[PDB]
Amino acid sequence: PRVSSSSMPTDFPLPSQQKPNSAVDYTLTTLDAVANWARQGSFWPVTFGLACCAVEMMHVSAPRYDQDRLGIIFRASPRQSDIMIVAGTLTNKMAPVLRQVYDQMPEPRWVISMGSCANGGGYYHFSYSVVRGCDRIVPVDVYVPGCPPTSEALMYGVFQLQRKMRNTKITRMWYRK
Amino acid sequence: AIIATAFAETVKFSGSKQELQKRTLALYRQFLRGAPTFADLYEVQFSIPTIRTKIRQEFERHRFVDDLSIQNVLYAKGHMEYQECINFWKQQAQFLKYFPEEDDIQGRHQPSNFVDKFLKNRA
Amino acid sequence: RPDAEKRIAAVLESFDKISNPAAITPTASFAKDLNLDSLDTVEVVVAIEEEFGIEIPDKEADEIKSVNQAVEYILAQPDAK
Amino acid sequence: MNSFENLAQDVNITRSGKTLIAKGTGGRSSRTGYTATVFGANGFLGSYLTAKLAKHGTTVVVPYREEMAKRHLKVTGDLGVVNFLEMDLRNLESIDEAVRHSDIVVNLIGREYETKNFNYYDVHVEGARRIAEAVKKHNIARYIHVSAFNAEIDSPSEFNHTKGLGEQVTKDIVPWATIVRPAPMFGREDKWFLDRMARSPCLVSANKFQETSNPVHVIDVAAALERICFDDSTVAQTFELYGPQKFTQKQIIDMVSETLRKEVRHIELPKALYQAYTKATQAIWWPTYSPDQVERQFLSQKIDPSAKTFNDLDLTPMELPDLMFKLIRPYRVNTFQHDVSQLENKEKTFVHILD
Amino acid sequence: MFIGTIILVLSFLGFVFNRRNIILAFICLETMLLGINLILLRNSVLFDDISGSLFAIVIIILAGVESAIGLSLLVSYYRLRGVINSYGI
Amino acid sequence: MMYLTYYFIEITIFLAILCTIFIISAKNPMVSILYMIALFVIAAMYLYLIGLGIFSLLYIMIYIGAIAVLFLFIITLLDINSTELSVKSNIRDLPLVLISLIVLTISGLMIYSNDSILINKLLEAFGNDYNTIITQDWFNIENTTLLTTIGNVLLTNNAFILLVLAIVLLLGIIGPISITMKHKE
Ligand SMILES: NC(=O)C1=CN([C@@H]2O[C@H](COP(=O)(O)OP(=O)(O)OC[C@H]3O[C@@H](n4cnc5c(N)ncnc54)[C@H](OP(=O)(O)O)[C@@H]3O)[C@@H](O)[C@H]2O)C=CC1
């Protein structure tokens, strides 16, 4: 008896507004919350992308604003990292190297654009030797404004990114799919 | 002293066409011998003959240039590009700038008569 | 001698620019047969040196201007005589 | 300067009474006027499609369910071009939102396997009906369904059965619907073809590797959908995008093995055992072959000769044996150099050990 | 008495019928010495004697020095030639 | 329970056979060195089985710890080409391999006995049938083990061999220097 009907519900709420009410739902919420706790408390960017305006990023590694207190560690290599920070000017002589480093990163992976020269080209927007935005190469999740963005702006941007991953659905979406 | 890199030639402006003929021919020969290296180093998706065809096209571009100084400039620029390519300085993009043709046909309508250009406001 | 001209005349007719499909002979000029311009005369010595797995110098890859000179230079046994 | 290679004119007019004036030369900043909607741009084919649409400034509405698979689409165009909505076939308002302001709609929905929330029927029939009813309500000018090759309303394969029912329902609500019927697509990061023959530890065929088909490069099918979205001659029509050369499974595998320079592993164990092993692997959460696909291993490609083809769009579809090098060179191991002899005498001149 | 004789014989045969490289030759020498030491230590246990273990420890010393000298000699060969081809010594 | 640990020696024999065949058949020599390490481990196991763990450990800290480190230290730095095991190249040795195997094994087994008739010399080697009684006496008073005994005899009764092994090790220092290090100055 081959299927030839469908009880497909309407009015099924969307993921943003999907509250839990079943034990499977609370369970998947707990597993997602733990995975996201892991993703938040260990937030390791790669040393690449920090060309120009590295001073303000190094000041977030400094005493007054310790990034390591949030579990941030900068790594030499993509393969161990999750996050890329496209600080500074993204020139046309460098974009392919950037895309290599981004494809080399293992999923899950995010991107956070620190500064104006990397968001929309900023000051050198009309130059011959510039990518007018790092969007053109890689997909960006958070845009920090500034030139050079204050250490506090970078920390706040990381606290917006932690929020993005914290309201992420890893298993609940599979229970939808 | 700051010594020259691998395949560097000293810039020397020949006073005659008969010597630059020889230098250009050596450059063409080196490009051809090195084309398989240009296929290995850059992850290329076509033939070595197609590279040699493009090289012949690029040398036919300026085949009819009789001003000696401009020829010396062209030869120096070509040796620069050979040094850029054979040493793995260029990446794939900067190399396949020279091979637009190999990439897939860009769309359908490629105007070649007037009326299509007018309908596309390109006339 | 037949070990060479056999592959030589192979790569000459493999070179499509020759307006004659079948005019390759010893004492066939690369130039005044008009089979080739000056660039093709280098494309051919290139295809020959790589056919035989060798690399000819500059002065002598200039001196190679006909089939007799090519067979006589491969005769020196660099490799793959 | 850049070009509008997709458009034949700059002033176009939809069948819904909208005028669409093009602006620019056809680069990142240009606008085609159009507004489309692609229900599976997150996937293998829809990704190449949105890339080709948004390269020229066509506004692209991209319904998504996972926020993280999609991000690789925002790159494909300027700001404001690519627009995202969270959607689900079990919510109707979401579908009306996605299709409201669209001149074009593109349905790429369909899994090669069943799930707990979606059987083959619910996703290939009811989902098509929901989208069709919204395409009809809002009277969208164009609708471009994609329904799998070999589709037939009643068939041993439930997949092809549903795919055939999705065809007739779409065309029985939206008479002006265009239907495409691609054959097995191949390319970089494909689902079940070259990445599998190049990565899977061992293949299996309940038949022999004998199922006949005409495969096709996915970029060309994306070119086809581009050349159909804008050509209004293709209403109430049907297409068979199959490809010039007929290839049996064993032929493809031998070319894959030749190009890879590694011996692909194939087994050829019978039907019921493989069908059972697939059925038991459908309980783990990750996609795997499903009982209905080994059923399709016995169903070669019957081509419908009454439907349009590539040559009705001025296309020259590509050949597998040429492209396999580009697609499989990454898995090429390239063990070492050939025939190291006649190199001792050359190596003898160099200094190998410094002091 | 068995295991030592077997490793010794198989390693002599793989030393003799190696048409491939040289590191197999070094390895087969070391395995031959191993099998000898096992033969000898088995006999030394069964007799409850010490001369066997003395000769065994001496073999270990001498075999390590053997490998040191052999792998300097190989390095000399490589100095001059640059490649240790499959059928060269 | 008792007889679960009865055939461990036969297991090690079978495993040593395997590792030898694998050393001989492997493509890349690095793998052959890894199998040699497996063989030295199996030997160390067998030595523990027969009551000599001290030599098991001396092997693991000498052979594996130094010699095999060095073998990898060489093959990592040298361009040691190869020729993968084949049938066109190595099959020709099968008759000679087989004859050599049979003769060398039967001779290596007959050699250890003093009987005059040949066949009985091998049938004596195959007589591993009877168990060895172990009695307990009370004459050993100290805590002397094998290493202490080795030190006593090596440093008293056989001092000369020690004072010659010092010179063997001087060769191990001085020859490799002379070979590798060019005293141009
Ligand atoms: N690729 C091929 O070889 C062939 C493909 N086809 C057809 O062409 C289309 C191509 O898809 P393909 O390129 O194969 O890559 P996919 O099949 O992975 O594309 C699947 C898309 O459909 C979406 N989707 C699937 N099920 C649902 C659902 N239940 N509710 C909502 N969205 C859903 C997915 O969204 P998400 O990714 O967010 O889950 C994904 O974007 C399909 O319709 C397929 O049947 C036909 C013949 C051969």
From TrEMBL, chain A:
Enzymatic class: oxidoreductase
Q: What is its EC number?
A: 1.6.99.3
Single GO molecular-function term?
quinone binding
The transmembrane residues are: none
Residues bound to [4Fe-4S] cluster are 52-53, 117, 147
Print the keywords alphabetically.
4Fe-4S, Iron, Iron-sulfur, Metal-binding, NAD, Oxidoreductase, Ubiquinone
The UniProt record lists the NADH:ubiquinone oxidoreductase-like 20kDa subunit domain at: 52-160
Spell out the residue ranges making up region: Disordered.
1-20
Keyword Cell membrane among record annotations: no
**Can you cite an annotated GO cellular component?**
mitochondrion
Which GO terms are recorded in the biological process aspect for this UniProt protein?
A: aerobic respiration; electron transport coupled proton transport; mitochondrial respiratory chain complex I assembly
Q: Where is the composition biased (Polar residues)?
A: 2-20
Family according to the record? Belongs to the complex I 20 kDa subunit family.
Protein name stated in the entry: Subunit NUKM of protein NADH:Ubiquinone oxidoreductase
Query: Which gene underlies this protein?
Result: nukm
Relative to the complete UniProt sequence, the shown stretch is 34 to 210 of 210
From TrEMBL, chain C:
Question: Where is it mostly found?
Answer: mitochondrion
A single GO CC term for this protein reads: mitochondrial [2Fe-2S] assembly complex
Print the keywords alphabetically: Electron transport, Fatty acid biosynthesis, Fatty acid metabolism, Lipid biosynthesis, Lipid metabolism, Mitochondrion, Phosphopantetheine, Phosphoprotein, Transit peptide, Transport
In the record, what terms sit under GO molecular function? acyl binding; acyl carrier activity
Name its cellular compartments. Mitochondrion
Q: In which pathway does it act?
A: Lipid metabolism; fatty acid biosynthesis
Residue intervals of the Carrier domain? 2-78
Function, as annotated: Carrier of the growing fatty acid chain in fatty acid biosynthesis.
Q: What is this protein called?
A: Acyl carrier protein
Taxonomic path: Eukaryota, Fungi, Dikarya, Ascomycota, Saccharomycotina
Residue range from the parent sequence: 29 to 109 of 109
From TrEMBL, chain D:
Q: Where are its TM segments located? A: none
Gene Ontology annotations for the cellular component aspect, listed alphabetically: mitochondrion
Organism's domain of life?
Eukaryota
Domain NAD-dependent epimerase/dehydratase, chain residue ranges per copy: 37-148
Binding residue positions for NADPH:
42, 44-45, 65, 108-109, 111, 163, 185
**Keywords of the record:** Nucleotide-binding
Gene Ontology MF: a single term? protein-containing complex binding
Classification via Gene3D superfamilies: NAD(P)-binding Rossmann-like Domain
> Matching InterPro entries, A to Z?
ComplexI_NDUFA9_subunit, Epimerase_deHydtase, NAD(P)-bd_dom_sf
Q: Which Pfam families match?
A: Epimerase
Protein name as it appears in the record: NAD-dependent epimerase/dehydratase domain-containing protein
UniProtKB/TrEMBL annotation, chain E:
Q: What is its main location?
A: mitochondrion
Q: According to its UniProt record, where is this protein located? A: Mitochondrion inner membrane; Mitochondrion membrane
| Reactions that this protein is recorded to catalyse | a ubiquinone + NADH + 5 H(+)(in) = a ubiquinol + NAD(+) + 4 H(+)(out)
Q: Which UniProt keywords apply?
A: Electron transport, Membrane, Mitochondrion, Mitochondrion inner membrane, NAD, Oxidoreductase, Respiratory chain, Translocase, Transmembrane, Transmembrane helix, Transport, Ubiquinone
Q: According to the UniProt record, what class of enzyme is this?
A: translocase
According to the UniProt entry, which residues carry N-formylmethionine?
Answer: 1
Topology relative to the membrane: Multi-pass membrane protein
Q: Name one GO cellular component term.
A: mitochondrial inner membrane
The transmembrane segments are 21-41, 53-78
Identify a single GO molecular function assigned to this protein: NADH dehydrogenase (ubiquinone) activity
User: Keyword Membrane: yes or no?
Assistant: yes
Q: Name one Pfam family in it.
A: Oxidored_q2
Superkingdom as given in the UniProt entry: Eukaryota
GO biological process, alphabetically ordered: ATP synthesis coupled electron transport
State what this protein does.
Core subunit of the mitochondrial membrane respiratory chain NADH dehydrogenase (Complex I) that is believed to belong to the minimal assembly required for catalysis. Complex I functions in the transfer of electrons from NADH to the respiratory chain. The immediate electron acceptor for the enzyme is believed to be ubiquinone. Core subunit of the mitochondrial membrane respiratory chain NADH dehydrogenase (Complex I) which catalyzes electron transfer from NADH through the respiratory chain, using ubiquinone as an electron acceptor.
Q: Return the PANTHER family for the record.
A: NADH-UBIQUINONE OXIDOREDUCTASE CHAIN 4L (PTHR11434:SF16), NADH-UBIQUINONE OXIDOREDUCTASE SUBUNIT ND4L (PTHR11434)
Q: Which family does it belong to?
A: Belongs to the complex I subunit 4L family.
Annotated protein name in UniProt: NADH-ubiquinone oxidoreductase chain 4L
